[PDB]
Amino acid sequence: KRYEKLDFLGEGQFATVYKARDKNTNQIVAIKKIKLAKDGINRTALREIKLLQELSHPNIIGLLDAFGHKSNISLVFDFMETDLEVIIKDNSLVLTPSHIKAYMLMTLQGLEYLHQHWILHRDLKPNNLLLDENGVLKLADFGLAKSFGSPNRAYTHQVVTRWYRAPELLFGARMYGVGVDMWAVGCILAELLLRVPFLPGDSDLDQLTRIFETLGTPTEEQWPDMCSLPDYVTFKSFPGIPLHHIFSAAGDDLLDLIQGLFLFNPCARITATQALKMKYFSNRPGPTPGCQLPRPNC
Amino acid sequence: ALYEYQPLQIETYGPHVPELEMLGRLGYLNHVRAASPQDLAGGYTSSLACHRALQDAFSGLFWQP
Amino acid sequence: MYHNSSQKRHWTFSSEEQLARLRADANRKFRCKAVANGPNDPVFLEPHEEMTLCKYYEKRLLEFCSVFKPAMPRSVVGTACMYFKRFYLNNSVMEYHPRIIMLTCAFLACKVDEFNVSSPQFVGNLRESPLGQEKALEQILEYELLLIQQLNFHLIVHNPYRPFEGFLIDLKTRYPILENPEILRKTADDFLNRIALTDAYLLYTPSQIALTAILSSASRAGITMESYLSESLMLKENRTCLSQLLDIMKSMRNLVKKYEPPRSEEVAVLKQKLERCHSAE
Ligand SMILES: *[C@@H](CC(=O)Nc1ccc(C(=O)N[C@@]2(C)CCC[C@@H](Nc3ncc(Cl)c(-c4c[nH]c5ccccc45)n3)C2)nc1)CN(C)C
């Protein structure tokens, strides 16, 4: 078709992504070609197509095109210059409070829109937060996204890359709401603060260990029905490190934000709208205007 | 320089949809099945089903092409 | 959600006369192909004959979906039926045979509505030999990208069924005049099926359809629900809106009246005609 592959950008599990230029127009694009053999077109290329044609928001990635042959399909996006994980793991970059405000703002606005249109992203992590060269953060990788609010509809766990996975999804909850994106937002905040993965477990039970070590093991008071989740195994009453001991550079505004994001009760966990109306975002200093956000020159 | 909150203003083209937390007082939730504990524990309430159903009913109701 | 959807935006049309102009050009476009590929011969279907064929094969699409095992969401079926309708707005039944495309439509819809069934259990619902069942799979897989291309990759379909449950929540809550609005279900559900056989799904919004179904049921039940539309939907206040809604719900009742099913005799002869296009071309 009308594109010339310029550069290989990476592999997902389900696809391999390349920089192209579309000969018609000065969009440089990330074509995500899917990899394969009698099930038809990949259910993950469809999942991204079906969900992204409907949504439109500056903090969600814009699907430009799709194209293919037989069972093999390309999805085409605007090429984003960078991602949030690259920024986090760039030792020369300094993330001021305004910078952490400006990324967390854009994530929550993208995610407010997404939840409004009844979709959970379910794979939030810093590499799935792309940042363009005008400094707008867009959610990307819609390949595991699902609509919610349907009672008669079982969902799966094993959504989210373990480190950003919410404890109800580690307890293998079948039904879940927007809390699964809000936890991941907490885990991404914590990682912008610390510059390392907040909770890097390497089994699903080593993840519940590192959650409960750090944030305390939930009581029933903090999570009334935890107990009825299928995989609910009881833990040692880990103390929890107080959040100002973990993020000692934080102010009580930001510690209220962080705290709301890490509530064990997925019902009491602050929504993206609740989060945007917290004093943290309206307080001084103001979020860095996207133009001034730090650009990694390699 | 401060950010200021302002809600998403999205034209739904039909009646007013009652607020999610209003649904239990406005009495709507008597007319959906209760979420069971496992669903509640995962963050899934009957209000979410009810809210989406009501929004589906009122979306586009007074639109014409 | 419906109000900013691709369905609203590209796939809901201003009248039946717009639809006929699409289908007329879909048949015409083909004839230039088959005239270049081959002559204004009698082999070709007329647009009304294709409409009979699409009406016939849409009832076969519902058969396949009603007898399907595991089971099937109405969501999936409605999406399939919608893809079937939408396919045949800009494509001719003499280029893409509706028997194939109805199974490409059920197949794509099973995936898009995230309804889990694999290629063997899928074609295991075709009443054919394992030779025929696995021949069907080759044609389903060859056409699946073509289906998606002709849908413009608008794969989300807003069906009347969720709207319909919304109005039922509302009527039980805040129109206590109708002491049990549940009784309106079967009749409204029956009316929905009939509305589905017409072009209504390309013309009215999901909510307008669900509301027409419920009110058609109430009127058939000897119940007046003027105070529901005026008071509860707050068109006692906005007047021009109450008329426009009634003009929409009455234009829909006309469709379910001025619809005639496929005649078996016509269907027999039309299948004959169709297969002489498909042995060729
Ligand atoms: C000096 C040298 C240097 O370091 N240059 C670099 C390094 C990295 C990149 C780059 O292209 N980075 C990525 C790969 C980071 C992730 C996002 C990529 N852009 C993109 N845009 C749209 C989509 Cl849909 C995607 C995408 C979605 N999923 C994936 C998975 C894997 C890969 C891509 C994916 N990606 C950009 N550029 C330059 C630098 N000089 C001094 C500037």
CA pair distance A191, A100, nearest whole angstrom? 10
**A91 and A60 both lie in a single domain:** no
**A143 and A157 both lie in a single domain:** yes
Structure tokens at C36: 């270049």
User: Which residues have C-beta within 8 Å of that of residue C43, sequence separation ≥ 6?
Assistant: C273, C276, C277, C280
**C84 and C183 both lie in a single domain:** no
Q: How far is the CA of C203 from the centre of ligand 1 (A)?
A: 44
| Count of CB atoms situated within 10 Å of the CB of C185 | 14
Residue B22 distance to chain A (closest CA, Å): 16
| Count of CB atoms situated within 10 Å of the CB of A293 | 22
Is residue C137 within 8 A of residue C119, CB to CB? The reply is yes
Q: DSSP labels for C47-89? A: HHHHHHHHHHHHHHHHHHHHS-SS---HHHHHHHHHHHHHHHH
CA pair distance A209, A237, nearest whole angstrom? 11
User: Which residues have C-beta within 8 Å of that of residue C76, sequence separation ≥ 6?
Assistant: C65, C106, C109, C110, C113, C115
CA pair distance A4, A21, nearest whole angstrom? 6
CATH of the domain at A213: 1.10.510.10
Helix (H, G, I), strand (E, B) or coil at A67: strand
Is residue B58 within 8 A of residue C245, CB to CB? The reply is no
Measuring CA to CA, which residue among A219, A212, A265, A221 is closest to residue A240? A212
Measuring CA to CA, which residue among A251, A129, A125, A138 is closest to residue A197? A125
User: In b/e form, how buried is each residue of A254-282, taking b as 16+ CB within 10 angstroms?
Assistant: bbbbbebbbbbbbbebbbbbebbebebbe
HEC string of A74-125 equals EEEEECCCEEHHHHHCCCCCCCCHHHHHHHHHHHHHHHHHHHHCCEECCCCC
What single DSSP character describes residue B36? P
Query: For residue A291, is it within any domain?
Result: no
A114 annotated to bind ligand: no
Tell me which chain B residue has its CA closest to the CA of residue A110. B8
Helix (H, G, I), strand (E, B) or coil at A257: helix
Structure tokens at C77: 């079926």
Q: How far is the CA of A28 from the centre of ligand 1 (A)?
A: 12
Measuring CA to CA, which residue among A112, A165, A121 is closest to residue A146? A121
Contacts of A173 in chain B (CB under 8 A): 38, 41-43
**Which residues of A carry out catalysis?**
123
Q: DSSP labels for C194-259? A: HHHTTGGGGTS-HHHHHHHHHHHHHHHTT---HHIIIIITTTTT-HHHHHHHHHHHHHHHHHHHS-
Pocket test for ligand 1, best of A80, A129, A134 (most atoms within 8 A of CB): A80
Distance of CA A64 to the CA centre of its chain: 21
Q: In angstroms, what is the C-alpha Rg of chain A?
A: 20
Peptide bond preceding A285 in cis form (omega within 30 of 0)? yes
**A94 and A115 both lie in a single domain:** yes
CA pair distance C212, C254, nearest whole angstrom? 11
Query: For residue A287, is it within any domain?
Result: no
Interface partners of chain B (CB pairs < 8 Å, 3 or more) are: A, C
Helix (H, G, I), strand (E, B) or coil at A16: strand
User: In b/e form, how buried is each residue of B26-37, taking b as 16+ CB within 10 angstroms?
Assistant: eebbebbeebee
**C132 and C179 both lie in a single domain:** no
**C173 and C124 both lie in a single domain:** no
**C46 and C95 both lie in a single domain:** yes
- Bridge-based pairing of strands A72-78 and A119-120 is unpaired
Structure tokens at C58: 């849409």
Helix (H, G, I), strand (E, B) or coil at A265: coil
| Count of CB atoms situated within 10 Å of the CB of A176 | 26
Choosing from A43, A78, A113, the residue where a domain stops is: A78
User: Which residues have C-beta within 8 Å of that of residue A233, sequence separation ≥ 6?
Assistant: A205
For residue C76, how many C-alpha atoms fall within 13 Å in the half-sphere facing its CB? 24
The CA-atom distances, in angstroms, between C9 and each of A35, B64, C222 are 32, 11, 36
**C109 and C230 both lie in a single domain:** no
Measuring CA to CA, which residue among A123, A160, A157 is closest to residue A142? A123
**C149 and C170 both lie in a single domain:** no
**C220 and C81 both lie in a single domain:** no
A220 annotated to bind ligand: no
CA pair distance A290, C224, nearest whole angstrom? 57
- At residue A294, what is the residue type? P
What single DSSP character describes residue B28? G
For residue C275, how many C-alpha atoms fall within 13 Å in the half-sphere facing its CB? 7
For residue C230, how many C-alpha atoms fall within 13 Å in the half-sphere facing its CB? 6
CA pair distance C131, A185, nearest whole angstrom? 52
A53 annotated to bind ligand: no
Q: DSSP labels for A115-156? A: HHTTEE----SGGGEEE-TT--EEE---TT-EE---TT----
Interface partners of chain A (CB pairs < 8 Å, 3 or more) are: B, C
Is residue A67 within 8 A of residue A74, CB to CB? The reply is yes
- What is the C-alpha end-to-end distance of chain C, expressed in Å? 41
Q: How far is the CA of A19 from the centre of ligand 1 (A)?
A: 9
**C42 and C14 both lie in a single domain:** yes
CATH of the domain at C184: 1.10.472.10
Structure tokens at A150: 């349907």
Structure tokens at A215: 């944030």
User: Which residues have C-beta within 8 Å of that of residue A104, sequence separation ≥ 6?
Assistant: A185, A189, A192, A257
Distance of CA C217 to the CA centre of its chain: 21
User: How buried is C67 (Cβ within 10 angstroms: 0-12 exposed, 13-18 middle, 19+ buried)?
Assistant: exposed
User: Which residues have C-beta within 8 Å of that of residue A161, sequence separation ≥ 6?
Assistant: A123, A125
| Count of CB atoms situated within 10 Å of the CB of A74 | 20
Query: For ligand 1, atom 42, which residue shows the shortest CA distance?
Result: A297
Closest CB from A69, A71, A116 relative to C141: A71
CA pair distance A208, A203, nearest whole angstrom? 9
User: In b/e form, how buried is each residue of C75-112, taking b as 16+ CB within 10 angstroms?
Assistant: bbbbbbbbbbbbbbbebbbbebbbbbbbbbbbbbbbbb
CA pair distance C242, A32, nearest whole angstrom? 48
**C187 and C216 both lie in a single domain:** yes
**A97 and A9 both lie in a single domain:** no
For residue A107, how many C-alpha atoms fall within 13 Å in the half-sphere facing its CB? 29
Containing H/E element for C271?
helix C264-278
Structure tokens at C252: 């829909």
**C63 and C165 both lie in a single domain:** no
Structure tokens at A140: 């990307």
| Count of CB atoms situated within 10 Å of the CB of C128 | 12
Is residue C171 within 8 A of residue C182, CB to CB? The reply is no
Is residue A63 within 8 A of residue A53, CB to CB? The reply is yes
Structure tokens at C245: 């809604």
What single DSSP character describes residue A30? E
What single DSSP character describes residue B30? G
Whose tokens are 């070609």? That residue is A33
Whose tokens are 């058609």? That residue is C216
CA pair distance B42, A232, nearest whole angstrom? 12
CA pair distance C268, C270, nearest whole angstrom? 6
Residue C154 distance to chain A (closest CA, Å): 7
**A259 and A120 both lie in a single domain:** yes
What single DSSP character describes residue A249? T
Please indicate if any CB of chain C lies within 8 Å of the CB of A117.
yes
Indicate yes or no: CB of B41 within 8 angstroms of CB of A173.
yes
CA pair distance A264, A240, nearest whole angstrom? 12
Q: DSSP labels for C108-155? A: HHHHHTT----HHHHHTTSSS-HHHHHHHHHHHHHHHHHHHHHTTT--
**C34 and C127 both lie in a single domain:** yes
* Ligand 1 near A32 CB (within 6 A): yes
CA pair distance A61, A80, nearest whole angstrom? 9
User: What is the resolution in angstroms?
Assistant: 2.4
Helices (H) and strands (E) in chain A, counts: 10, 10
CA pair distance A102, A285, nearest whole angstrom? 11
Experimental method: cryo-EM
What single DSSP character describes residue A22? E
Please indicate if any CB of chain B lies within 8 Å of the CB of A267.
yes
| Count of CB atoms situated within 10 Å of the CB of C261 | 11
What single DSSP character describes residue C37? H
**A68 and A90 both lie in a single domain:** no
Q: Per the structure, how many domains does chain A have?
A: 2
What single DSSP character describes residue A60? B
**A140 and A262 both lie in a single domain:** yes
Residue-number span of the structural domain to which A152 is assigned: 82-278
Query: For ligand 1, atom 2, which residue shows the shortest CA distance?
Result: A298
Measuring CA to CA, which residue among A97, A30, A37, A109 is closest to residue A72? A37
Distance of CA A243 to the CA centre of its chain: 22
Choosing from A48, A78, A108, the residue where a domain stops is: A78
Containing H/E element for A68?
strand A63-69
Choosing from A38, A62, A78, the residue where a domain stops is: A78
HEC string of A171-184 equals CCCCCCCCHHHHHH
Query: For residue A297, is it within any domain?
Result: no
Query: For ligand 1, atom 3, which residue shows the shortest CA distance?
Result: A298
A109 annotated to bind ligand: no
- What sign for the dihedral angle of Cα A192, A85, A122, B18? positive
Query: For residue A284, is it within any domain?
Result: no
**C32 and C152 both lie in a single domain:** yes
Residue-number span of the structural domain to which C11 is assigned: 3-157+261-280
Q: Per the structure, how many domains does chain C have?
A: 2
What single DSSP character describes residue C93? T
For residue A81, how many C-alpha atoms fall within 13 Å in the half-sphere facing its CB? 14
Is residue A253 within 8 A of residue A165, CB to CB? The reply is no
Measuring CA to CA, which residue among C79, C233, C74 is closest to residue C161? C74
Packed helices C130-150 and C98-112: angle between N→C axes, nearest 10 degrees? 70
